[PDB]
Ligand binder design. Structure first.
Ligand code: K
Ligand code: MG
Ligand code: MG
Ligand code: MG
Ligand code: MG
Ligand code: MG
Ligand code: MG
Ligand code: MG
Ligand code: MG
Ligand code: MG
Ligand code: MG
Ligand code: MG
Ligand code: MG
Ligand code: MG
Ligand code: MG
Ligand code: MG
Ligand code: MG
Ligand code: MG
Ligand code: MG
Ligand code: MG
Ligand code: MG
Ligand code: MG
Ligand code: MG
Ligand code: MG
Ligand code: MG
Lengths: 143, 141, 64, 101, 66, 84, 148, 57, 67, 189
RNA sequence: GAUAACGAACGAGACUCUGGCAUGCUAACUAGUUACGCGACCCCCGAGCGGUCGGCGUCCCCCAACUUCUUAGAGGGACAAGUGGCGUUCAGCCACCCGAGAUUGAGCAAUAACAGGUCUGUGAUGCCCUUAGAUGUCCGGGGCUGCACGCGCGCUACACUGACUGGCUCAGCGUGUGCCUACCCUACGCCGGCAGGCGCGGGUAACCCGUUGAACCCCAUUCGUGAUGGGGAUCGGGGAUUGCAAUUAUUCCCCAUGAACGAGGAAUUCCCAGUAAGUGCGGGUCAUAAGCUUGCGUUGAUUAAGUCCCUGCCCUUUGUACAC
């Protein structure tokens, strides 16, 4: 009856969107998906084989709510608490390559286009399927 | 040309402004349904005004909230204070004062903070101590 | 059985007592039998109308 | 007819407001359209210093602070008219910065 | 030389260099193994410490007694 | 260095990573009956590791032998099947 | 599935190092001196075996594969920045030191420093900190002396 | 556009200027009845005003 | 800690002697009176003086006092 | 109508101790959906007597620094503990919590009066407010110690601590401490 | 109030700053809302004046109003004023109503002193010493950090009320390109796994960084009572950045190594409400640069409304062989 992204649980929504990106096997996952650490503040690599789709799903969801975000804004969004061991913790940003490639991969799907000032924003095609996936996320809930 | 009241609820530095306009029972916070505002652990807090007054009093009005500043818990309290103050102000300006009284006293007799703001703020830090009152450890020998 | 527990309502707060002021002499009236009041030392915050559970209910407080 | 914004800035509230009131009036009585003085957020230049000159004693601190209050006056007038309205509003503590277009 | 920050190059292997430690020019042969290190890293600037008997004040029992 | 304390050592827990013929059946019969069913109570009741206790419970839920009460990242509670 | 396999290896003998078979394979191979959590995980992903299984459930064929990847990381597209022995001071070989081999490399590196009389070597010869730390108040392992 | 400083610095820079100017005059007109100094900036020029008794000196 | 200092009391007793007729039992009217018949440099001081004046007026109207 | 967490009713809870009837808030005008009120009960003396007893339990589970200022986690912990209690006992978890409070708070204590050191304690009575306050403290610290370095989660540790206290068994940490306090007071009587 | 005192003066209070209130007032394209138009997308028509939009415009300039939210400025507001009780009427105290608030937190701060600290802040300074093989000054190197040890402020821990993996989502204070003076905050795009590099812009700032996507927390995951997936000390290898110079390892990142520590003896510190504690974030220092400090928000209690017992303080009487 009319469902957009901001009407459904975002935890479920990212899971569903990641599966859709996985099922439509066009996203360009890089070769270094399984050997890198997502951020210098992390100790271990992700406990998930196809985490790239989940990160890509999260980014597209994020670009829907705040358009114009570039790589640095992605690192800020995915930044976290670096436990420096015996010294006190601080805030550490995410990986720039990981963010840049997630952005670059979404352009191949024609879901994300570079913004005029800078950063990237969602194509109407990229906005249509997110609202569509939100529809089935809502559809599962009421069922 | 429409029945509309903008009323603001507050908690610490979290400001939540509720646009209460003549509608059909649509309540949304920052463009999200009221049941989708985290953390759901304090969700009954957001649902307090609706639960105590019922759906029928919210039926003929649509509320949209813009929330800024503060933290997750303060944002929830301010949001619930705005929805309470709005259904009171809306019933005050357009509906009669008689009915506006019962929606007010019922809210107050349950929780005073639904209508009346909490004046508490962070006390300033004073030198010679980590915080407002605590002082650094004193060593004598 | 012997020395059954007794309940008495604080009717008056005489004042504080004890070395650091931790206790409070209060006059308590037995609820089962009115007109019978005794003084008792109470630790913790107490006020008028409180009900106290006296495990042993035959000792007058003196000064403590 | 040019848009002119005069930037007002001082450390004295009373002295600045007497200028913001005086300029707004002077324009109104000459039939000039005025944008109400825009009160920009106050800047609080704070300095905290150890107080003692040598490091002996209880750790006491001096909380120095400078407050700077900024005002914008935007209106349409020829450059000729705005010259004299600025000249009349003299003040030691208030600094004026006229801009055009 | 005073240049404690010079790094040993392969060209300078087989040279007898007196590296100033602050007081004396310590004589050091540039063995080929020294490639990649600093010239002053083989001229220590301090005598290693051999502890003596702790003095009065080194402990409470000693410091406060009059 | 001088120790101003004492350690209350306890006989250590040797917990089974995987189930043997003694326990797999012990889980299939006694665990569903319990009024309260959690990975903690199962681990202590029949001496297995928590991850095995967490794992073993979820098939019992899929098999329908136990009923889930609540699920949380730090607490999962199951109960025995109800009748009416 | 959850019942103990009939060939469960309760302990493993890899590179003359016991590997506990009750731990997850990701954290079991951590016991090998030279393999940490990061290195253990990257080699198992190259071995294409599910990490959600214990080390004792691991068949003999894959166990042999896992060792070969650990001995030969550069052959299985593991980048040089994972290697704990990058650009050796003797032959620029890039490799990961393992088992008593790490011990030999560390011993050779310390003796190298001690044989050239370098400051970090001398500081290693003595029981002193070599990374510039202040030793006046910390790293106290000795006994109280006192004033007589 | 040629050269400009922040307002926060601006107020510190001229406040420092007055502090040195007052200090210099205090050292200079010590034998005179120097009471203070006031700076009067205007569009053509500034008017360093010296409040002092015995102005003839 | 609501004891009024001599400055509050000296002003208030004097105002009732000097302008008793224009005063009354209402703090809000008395507050306004003090604004014109006296020069009170701060608002808080004015409300304290008017507070004591209101208190005095009741007493000065039920019996004689120092004023 | 109002139920704690939306499922636990309050109108069925009965207080079987007139001494603590005025210091346990489990009834009309005190029934709340969540033990998170952000009220100013610490502004005035005795104002915490009107604080909901479930909130008071929630407040007292934030202990030992690492858990300070984490009331959400504690609301979850109390939420799961009530679910666990209902499974074991079968009746209202609030009723179990009330019965735990009644049986855990000591009825006689022993204050210390020593003229010059060598303090010799003297037996005294306990005010109803302190009976409630310490009963919550004992039950919370009983759960805290049971869950430390143990696989069983704090939620279950809190549940059987309340369940044992409600039945009065010596297995409860709170009942052990209460009996010791009464026994010492009996000796110092 | 009493009164051999009377009339005063400082301090206290008043005062200044700050916080809480104002749908009253004054204005705002360097603040925003609401309405409208345009556009993007969603579902069924259950089309609808529907739902989302930090997409765009309605500035000036032809194309909207307003000022709730925001800024900051003039006023207002709280005074023990109202009611009840107590107090010798009195000064006042307690409780309650109304109310945003019925004690917000700081700044300033008397007399007389201390052989308290500072001559290593000064072109503040007496005296004294030195002055060309200098205690002046400069340049090179080293030291301040040297480690059987004793102590002080701390940081991080001892884990499951946790760690880790991912996902989701909220701050406030505040700084930012330079007399000398080299030295700024950084968006975006590309390269690199990271630290970083390169290019291209904005901002002397309510204008750009920045809607400051902070952290704990929240939700899911793995773990499983094992010095362990707790802890992260020590140490090997390698890469980059700042600098004229990085060794005694500046700092940073990677792989590996994986110490004590299982809640701490006698003792002892700080603290009562948005406080303690957790948690992160600005400023200062800064070519490089926080385990410190100084400030800020964020989550947020237990206990107490007492006392003089301990450590001290103030007033009166009292004793004194004390007056450094
Ligand atoms: K001198
Ligand atoms: Mg983050
Ligand atoms: Mg704090
Ligand atoms: Mg001794
Ligand atoms: Mg546990
Ligand atoms: Mg306003
Ligand atoms: Mg009377
Ligand atoms: Mg003084
Ligand atoms: Mg001296
Ligand atoms: Mg000096
Ligand atoms: Mg010095
Ligand atoms: Mg030198
Ligand atoms: Mg030093
Ligand atoms: Mg010392
Ligand atoms: Mg100190
Ligand atoms: Mg760790
Ligand atoms: Mg520069
Ligand atoms: Mg902007
Ligand atoms: Mg370990
Ligand atoms: Mg503990
Ligand atoms: Mg810094
Ligand atoms: Mg320092
Ligand atoms: Mg005393
Ligand atoms: Mg002390
Ligand atoms: Mg005598």
């Amino acid at each position: 009856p009319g469902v957009t992204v901001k009407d459904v649980n975002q935890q479920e929504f990212v899971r569903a969107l990641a599966a859709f990106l996985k099922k439509s096997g066009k996203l360009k996952v890089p070769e270094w998906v399984d050997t890198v650490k997502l951020a210098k503040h992390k100790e271990l690599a992700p406990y998930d084989e196809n985490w790239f789709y989940t990160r890509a799903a999260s980014t597209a969801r994020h670009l829907y709510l705040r358009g114009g975000a570039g790589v640095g804004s992605m690192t800020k969004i995915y930044g976290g608490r670096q436990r420096n061991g015996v010294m006190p913790s601080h805030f550490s940003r995410g990986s720039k390559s990981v963010a840049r490639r997630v952005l670059q991969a979404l352009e191949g799907l024609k879901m994300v286009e570079k913004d005029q000032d800078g950063g990237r924003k969602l194509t109407p095609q990229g906005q249509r399927d997110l609202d569509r996936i939100a529809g089935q996320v809502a559809a599962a809930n009421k069922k | 040309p429409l029945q509309s009241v903008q009323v603001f609820g507050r908690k610490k530095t979290a400001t939540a402004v509720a646009h209460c306009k003549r509608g059909n029972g649509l309540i949304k916070v920052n463009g999200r349904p009221l049941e989708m505002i985290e953390p759901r652990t304090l969700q009954y807090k957001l649902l307090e005004p609706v639960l105590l007054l019922g759906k029928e009093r919210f039926a003929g009005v649509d509320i949209r909230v813009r929330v800024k500043g503060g933290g997750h818990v303060a944002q929830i309290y301010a949001i619930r204070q705005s929805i309470s103050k709005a259904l009171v102000a809306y019933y005050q300006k357009y509906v009669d004062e008689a009915s506006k009284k019962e929606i007010k006293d019922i809210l107050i007799q349950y929780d005073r903070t639904l209508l009346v703001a909490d004046p508490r703020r962070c006390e300033s830090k004073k030198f010679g101590g980590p915080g407002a009152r605590a002082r650094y450890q004193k060593s004598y020998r | 059985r012997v020395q059954p527990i007794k309940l008495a309502r604080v009717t008056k707060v005489l004042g504080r007592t004890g070395s650091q002021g931790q206790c409070t002499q209060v006059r308590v009236e037995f609820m089962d039998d009115t007109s019978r009041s005794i003084i008792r030392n109470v630790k913790g915050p107490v006020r008028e109308g409180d009900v106290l559970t006296l495990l042993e209910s035959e000792r007058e407080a003196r000064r403590l | 007819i040019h848009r002119i914004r005069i930037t007002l800035t001082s450390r004295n509230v009373k002295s600045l407001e007497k200028v913001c009131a005086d300029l707004i009036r002077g324009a109104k009585e000459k039939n000039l359209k005025v944008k109400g003085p825009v009160r920009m957020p106050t800047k609080t230049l704070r300095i905290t210093t150890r107080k003692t000159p040598c490091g002996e004693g209880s750790k006491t601190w001096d909380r120095f602070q400078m407050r700077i209050h900024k005002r914008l006056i935007d209106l349409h007038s020829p450059s000729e008219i705005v010259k004299q309205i600025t000249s009349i509003s003299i003040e030691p503590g208030v600094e004026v910065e006229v801009t055009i277009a | 030389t005073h240049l404690r920050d010079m790094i040993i190059l392969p060209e300078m292997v087989g040279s007898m260099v007196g590296v100033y430690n602050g007081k004396t020019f310590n004589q050091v042969e540039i063995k080929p193994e020294m490639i990649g290190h600093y010239l002053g890293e083989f001229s220590i600037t301090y005598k290693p410490v051999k502890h003596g008997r702790p003095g009065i004040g080194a402990t409470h029992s000693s410091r406060f007694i009059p | 260095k001088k120790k101003w304390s004492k350690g209350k050592v306890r006989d250590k827990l040797n917990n089974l990573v995987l189930f043997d013929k003694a326990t797999y059946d012990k889980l299939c019969k006694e665990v569903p009956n319990y009024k309260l069913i959690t990975p903690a109570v199962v681990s202590e009741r029949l001496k297995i590791r928590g991850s095995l206790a967490r794992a073993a419970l979820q098939e019992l839920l899929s098999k329908g032998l136990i009923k889930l009460v609540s699920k949380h990242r730090a607490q999962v509670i199951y109960t025995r099947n109800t009748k009416g | 599935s959850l019942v103990i396999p009939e060939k469960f290896q309760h302990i493993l003998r890899v590179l003359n190092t016991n590997i506990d078979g009750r731990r997850k394979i990701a954290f079991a191979i951590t016991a090998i001196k030279g393999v940490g959590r990061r290195y253990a995980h990257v080699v198992l992903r190259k071995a294409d075996i599910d990490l959600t299984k214990r080390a004792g459930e691991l068949t003999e064929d894959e166990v042999e594969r896992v060792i070969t990847i650990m001995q030969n990381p550069r052959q299985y597209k593991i980048p040089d920045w994972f290697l704990n022995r990058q650009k050796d001071v003797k032959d620029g070989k890039y490799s990961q030191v393992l088992a008593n081999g790490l011990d030999n490399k560390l011993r050779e590196d310390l003796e190298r420093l001690k044989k050239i009389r370098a400051h970090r070597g001398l500081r290693h010869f003595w029981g002193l900190r070599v990374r510039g730390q202040h030793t006046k108040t910390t790293g106290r392992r000795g006994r109280t002396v006192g004033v007589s | 556009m040629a050269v400009q400083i922040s307002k926060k610095r601006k107020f510190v820079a001229d406040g420092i200027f007055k502090a040195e100017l007052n200090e210099f005059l205090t050292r200079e007109l010590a034998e005179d009845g120097y009471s203070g100094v006031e700076v009067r900036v205007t569009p053509t020029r500034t008017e360093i005003i010296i409040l002092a008794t015995r102005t003839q000196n | 800690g609501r004891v009024r200092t001599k400055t509050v009391k000296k002003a208030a007793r004097v105002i009732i002697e000097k302008y008793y007729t224009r005063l009354g039992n209402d703090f809000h009217t008395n507050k306004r009176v003090c604004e014109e018949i006296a020069i009170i440099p701060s608002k808080k001081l004015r409300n304290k003086i008017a507070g004591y004046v209101t208190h005095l007026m009741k007493r000065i109207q039920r019996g004689p006092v120092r004023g | 109508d109002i139920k704690l967490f939306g499922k636990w009713s309050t109108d069925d809870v009965q207080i079987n101790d007139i001494s603590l009837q005025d210091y346990i808030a489990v009834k009309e005008k005190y029934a709340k959906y969540l033990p998170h009120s952000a009220g100013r009960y610490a502004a005035k003396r005795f104002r915490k007597a009107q604080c909901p007893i479930v909130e008071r339990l929630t407040n007292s589970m934030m202990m030992h620094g690492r858990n300070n200022g984490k009331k959400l986690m504690t609301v979850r912990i109390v939420k799961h503990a009530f679910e666990i209690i209902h499974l074991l006992t079968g009746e209202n978890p609030l009723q179990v919590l009330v019965n735990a409070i009644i049986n855990s708070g000591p009825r006689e204590d022993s204050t210390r009066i020593g003229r010059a050191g060598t303090v010799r304690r003297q037996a005294v009575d306990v005010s109803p407010l302190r009976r409630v306050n310490q009963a919550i403290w004992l039950l919370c610290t009983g759960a805290r110690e049971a869950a430390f370095r143990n696989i069983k989660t704090i939620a279950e540790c809190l549940a059987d601590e309340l369940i044992n206290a409600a039945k009065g068994s010596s297995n409860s940490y709170a009942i052990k401490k209460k009996d010791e306090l009464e026994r010492v007071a009996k000796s110092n009587r």
